């Protein structure tokens, strides 16, 4: 007997939708976290609520971390030690909150969503998200710890790649976004620029060749991501 448990899931989902309208993304993520923890799979729309909520939370933290790390680097070039300790301390604080959010997302993926994922679109979506959030840890880690995170991310992305190559057309936006993010992983994190350019080129070309087969809506989703694949390629070449 689970009616009260179903109605709680539905209340959380609804409050997440409200938090999204209100642009209150920390709340949105807490609500979606609760909904995931009720046990059921997520619909396509629920997957996107989950993704949008945590993408905003961790996006604000990464932009913050990048700004502070930029300041801290220039401060270990001048000897400017008078305002020295505070930049380091505050960078480390933001960094720890960033890592906590990624751990939360990774906990949801590995404990609930990846294993209970019905179809193939869903497995690719969650596996890609797993790679992304390890990638976000990798942006702040150093040394051998960074190299272990890289291994987990590469491993999640490669498995999403294998499923997407067999199950989805080259123009599918989830496949395209996965390949884009994997290619960003190769150049900015795993220092595999050749693999990044080769992956971004192949993904762009194979999508380009099928664009004439798409509806107007499919075509707009696919080409928006193709412009990012090419802008990256411009920057990497």
């Amino acid at each position: 007997h689970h009616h009260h448990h179903h109605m709680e899931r539905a209340s959380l989902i609804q409050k997440a939708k409200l938090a999204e309208q209100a642009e209150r993304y920390e709340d949105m993520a807490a609500f979606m976290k609760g909904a995931v923890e009720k046990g059921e799979e997520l619909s396509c729309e629920e997957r996107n609520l989950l993704s949008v909520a945590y993408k905003n939370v961790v996006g604000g933290q990464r932009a913050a971390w990048r700004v502070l790390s930029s300041i801290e680097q220039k401060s270990n070039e001048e000897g400017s030690e008078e305002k020295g300790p505070e930049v380091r301390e505050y960078r480390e604080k933001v960094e720890t909150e960033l890592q906590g959010v990624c751990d939360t997302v990774l906990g949801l993926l590995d404990s609930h969503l990846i294993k209970e994922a019905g179809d193939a679109e869903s497995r690719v979506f969650y596996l890609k998200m797993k790679g992304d959030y390890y990638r976000y840890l990798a942006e702040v880690a150093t040394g051998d710890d960074k190299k272990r995170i890289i291994d987990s991310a590469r491993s999640a992305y490669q498995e999403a790649m294998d499923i997407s190559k067999k199950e989805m057309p080259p123009t599918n936006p989830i496949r395209l976004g996965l390949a884009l993010n994997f290619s960003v992983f190769h150049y900015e994190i795993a220092n595999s620029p050749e693999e990044a350019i080769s992956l971004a080129k192949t993904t762009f070309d194979e999508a380009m060749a099928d664009l004439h087969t798409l509806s107007e809506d499919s075509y707009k989703d696919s080409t928006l991501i193709m412009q990012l694949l090419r802008d990256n390629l411009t920057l990497w070449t």
């Binding site: 996107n48 990048r66 993010n181 960003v184 150049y187 900015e188 990012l228 990256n232 920057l235």
Partner: peptide, 8 residues
């Protein structure tokens, strides 16, 4: 960052 990932 000039590099871009997937906006979702």
């Amino acid at each position: 960052r000039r590099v871009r990932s997937d906006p979702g």
